[PDB]
Design an enzyme around this catalytic site. Structure first.
Site, PDB file in Angstrom:
ATOM      1  N   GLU B  46       0.828  -1.197   0.000  1.00  0.00           N
ATOM      2  CA  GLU B  46       0.000   0.000   0.000  1.00  0.00           C
ATOM      3  C   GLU B  46       0.873   1.260   0.000  1.00  0.00           C
ATOM      4  O   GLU B  46       1.957   1.293   0.592  1.00  0.00           O
ATOM      5  CB  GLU B  46      -0.948   0.001   1.193  1.00  0.00           C
ATOM      6  CG  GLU B  46      -0.327   0.341   2.521  1.00  0.00           C
ATOM      7  CD  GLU B  46      -1.344   0.244   3.645  1.00  0.00           C
ATOM      8  OE1 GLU B  46      -2.233  -0.629   3.545  1.00  0.00           O
ATOM      9  OE2 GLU B  46      -1.270   1.031   4.615  1.00  0.00           O
ATOM     10  N   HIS B  85       6.185  -1.056  13.527  1.00  0.00           N
ATOM     11  CA  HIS B  85       5.093  -0.501  12.748  1.00  0.00           C
ATOM     12  C   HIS B  85       4.868   0.944  13.180  1.00  0.00           C
ATOM     13  O   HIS B  85       4.903   1.247  14.381  1.00  0.00           O
ATOM     14  CB  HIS B  85       3.832  -1.348  12.943  1.00  0.00           C
ATOM     15  CG  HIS B  85       2.660  -0.908  12.126  1.00  0.00           C
ATOM     16  ND1 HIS B  85       1.375  -1.338  12.382  1.00  0.00           N
ATOM     17  CD2 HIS B  85       2.572  -0.082  11.056  1.00  0.00           C
ATOM     18  CE1 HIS B  85       0.546  -0.801  11.503  1.00  0.00           C
ATOM     19  NE2 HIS B  85       1.248  -0.034  10.686  1.00  0.00           N
TER      20      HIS B  85
END
Lengths: 88, 86
Positions: B46, B85
């Site tokens: 993405e 993350h």
């Protein structure tokens, strides 16, 4: 300080990952050292001549050499790995 | 196609080499896939936005993302991160 691999040098690094992790470790040590002191330290660095002038080489083992070049100035430099398998 | 690491992402990769071979394998596979199809395929690539426009992310595991940019011409895959993350 960026670390740059070519298609072929990454392929051979992968080869070592698949067949001898000790060699991977030696190469990582050579990388660490060359990023710190490009012209000195581990692996007896020596300048190559001719069409390979600007390039340097260190020993991984007697049969396998780590060929590289550190480029760039001051604070934005890169180490380019050209080979990490076989003689020069 | 050349493979570019930063000091931070190479440190990430070395950390995985030292601590979890499965992660190293998963990263190597994402690198391999992204070289042939930079914006599609393994890990559900993405595109990021704003702060990190031009960057892309793929899932390594639940808690670890592979973040990269493609720059260049006649090219480079730049790995920016492969641990943690956000």
């Amino acid at each position: 300080m960026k670390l740059v691999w070519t298609l072929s040098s990454w392929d051979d690094y992968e080869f070592w990952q698949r067949t001898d992790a000790r060699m991977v470790e030696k190469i990582n040590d050579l990388i660490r050292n060359a990023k710190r002191t490009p012209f000195a330290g581990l692996g007896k660095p020596e300048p190559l001549k001719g069409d390979m002038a600007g390039y340097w080489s260190r020993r991984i083992t007697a049969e396998h050499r780590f060929v590289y070049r550190v480029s760039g100035s001051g604070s934005e430099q890169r180490l380019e790995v050209i080979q990490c398998r076989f003689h020069y």
